[PDB]
């Protein structure tokens, strides 16, 4: 009588790993059927989980990523706990193959393993996104340097630096949106990136005008400054929106 929900995974990669399990769990939940001796297959799951936990502990204990270090354990904890339910189920089924409580454990344990493994994969996914965010923040920081460019020589250096930086950022975003399952988020990323790319030449043009105006005589630089600053502000707004969107999740990603 309880309703359930199989996840719409966060990325295509996670989907390809976990979809089979989710589909098989759904099939068993919906099925109309005694259960055979599951001691051995459950033991194989137990062994796999133990290996995974061992590797997870090594990672937690060696990673310099303080955030990964903190978010990982709860996921492995959920997986281990769910595994204990499968073990209990197999033990119960040895004496009573028709046990209803045993079947309940099998289902809860299977779902808990799916949910814990998904949580685990999402923690590693978040670490990957943090790498993209770091690049975005480097661009925001470099945009603050525009105001210090006051010679044509420095403008050449600046453009030759910001240009490739934007290209790298754009590539990371393009690759990321291609991995996302949620269409709404992909659209936002692509739209913001396009806006940012379009503003780049506008910024360089504004900086060239500022440099030219400054290095002249009796010209007022107030307008050139304003126009440069306006463009930097718009670009920074767009990049912050990319950073915000890269971190969005969805309710439909939960399994229950």
């Amino acid at each position: 009588h309880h309703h359930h929900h199989m996840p719409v995974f966060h990325t295509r990669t996670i989907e390809s790993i976990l979809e089979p399990v989710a589909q098989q769990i759904s099939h068993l939940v919906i099925m109309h059927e005694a259960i055979p001796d599951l001691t051995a297959p459950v033991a194989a799951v137990q062994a796999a989980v133990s290996n995974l936990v061992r590797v997870g502990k090594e990672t937690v204990q060696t990673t310099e990523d303080q955030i990964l270090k903190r978010d990982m354990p709860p996921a492995f904890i959920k997986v281990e706990n769910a595994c204990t339910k499968l073990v209990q189920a197999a033990q119960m089924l040895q004496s009573d193959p028709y046990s209803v409580p045993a079947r309940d454990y099998l289902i809860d344990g299977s779902r808990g393993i799916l949910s814990g493994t998904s949580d685990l994969l999402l923690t590693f996914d978040e670490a990957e996104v943090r790498k993209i965010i770091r690049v975005c923040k480097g661009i925001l920081e470099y945009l603050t340097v525009a105001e210090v460019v006051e010679t044509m020589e420095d403008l050449v250096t600046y453009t030759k630096n910001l240009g490739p930086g934007m290209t790298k950022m754009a590539k990371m975003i393009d690759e990321r949106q291609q991995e996302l399952t949620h269409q709404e988020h992909r659209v936002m990323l692509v739209n913001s990136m396009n806006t940012v790319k379009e503003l780049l030449p506008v910024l360089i043009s504004a900086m060239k005008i500022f440099v030219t105006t400054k290095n002249s005589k009796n010209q007022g630089i107030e307008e050139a400054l304003k126009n440069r600053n306006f463009t930097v502000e718009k670009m920074s707004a767009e990049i912050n929106e990319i950073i915000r969107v890269l971190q969005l999740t969805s309710w439909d990603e939960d399994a229950w």
């Binding site: 098989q24 055979p36 297959p41 799951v45 995974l52 590797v55 997986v79």
Partner: peptide, 24 residues
């Protein structure tokens, strides 16, 4: 789909996840 098959799948999936970690 049966319990024996689902359990085999789970074990394989877990091994897959461990491998992802080991290669990262």
């Amino acid at each position: 789909v049966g319990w024996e098959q689902l359990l085999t799948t789970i074990a394989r999936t877990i091994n897959e996840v461990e491998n992802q970690i080991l290669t990262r």
